[PDB]
Design a protein around this ligand. Structure first.
Ligand SMILES: [Mg+2]
Ligand SMILES: [Mg+2]
Lengths: 77, 76, 77, 76
DNA sequence: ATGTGACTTATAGTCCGTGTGATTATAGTCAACAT
DNA sequence: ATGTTGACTATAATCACACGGACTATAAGTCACAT
């Protein structure tokens, strides 16, 4: 659909694997459906900031460092 | 209320103000609704990334500089 | 594929719903995959007695009462 | 070892004996392997439902009477 | 006749993911009247 | 100009499930030698 989204979902998946988490853990750890997390990662979802926040607490990562990785992903080529 | 959600709004307002833009104008520019934008700016809406993106296009700021600012604001 | 199996999986699903459990409770409660329970219930699986035992403890049901329902299901026309 | 698994085997042995069948004969009759049946009967195999079903056909007993017996045996 | 041990292969059981239909909560959009 | 209040609809988010490919553990099936 949209630029920022595909970047957001790329970063969530990048962190998650970096931390050796499976989708499963992530979903409990961050209080969303197992399906929701999957659906984000197939970039098929446009999440709310509140949800983003919950995912960030899920990845055990600070808002700051998350956005620092966003920025970097946006910049690749 | 959410901490992040409130810094995002603070920033939107900040950028709009640095640009001497009214809400009415931000709403026109981004094709969203004045009542919408008002609501965000008093932190009474929790917006979807897509909406954020539309507001960024209206402020006329790149996602990169938006998040650069957001980080700065978050850090106090 | 086989007579007894379709009867066994019919009974597991019958008890589970009777107890208002979803597949995933069942799967944790009984220490098997979420997928395994599903696959049994689509009667696509031929389980070990040990696994059966684990499912029975899962449904919070005695071996006895389980087989009493087997018998009844085998009998139904 | 499993309690159920051991009553199942006890029963198989019981039915075979009430029929005066040898293992060799139960193996032939059910098209499985003598060493397989031996192993079950000293509770050293944890068999699939399918196999159980094969052994039941070899004993020549209906699932219904098998489980009737299994319950009785379970109850001590 | 039965028991045991060792070995191979077929498949039970595990683990991590994709995809979806149905339902509930809430964001996305707008009117009215406010200042 | 901005703020606030509802009502309306579109979709974010939830909940019970099915299905898949890849992988590990173990049952299913045979010999060998045993008694
Ligand atoms: Mg929840
Ligand atoms: Mg386990």
């Amino acid at each position: 659909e949209s630029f920022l989204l595909s970047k957001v979902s790329f970063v969530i998946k990048k962190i998650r694997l970096e931390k050796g988490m499976t989708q499963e853990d992530l979903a409990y750890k961050s209080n969303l459906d197992r399906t929701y997390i999957s659906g984000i990662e197939r970039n098929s979802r446009n999440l709310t900031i509140k949800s983003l926040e919950l995912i960030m607490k899920g990845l055990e990562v600070s808002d700051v460092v998350f956005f620092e990785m966003l920025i970097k992903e946006i910049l690749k080529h």
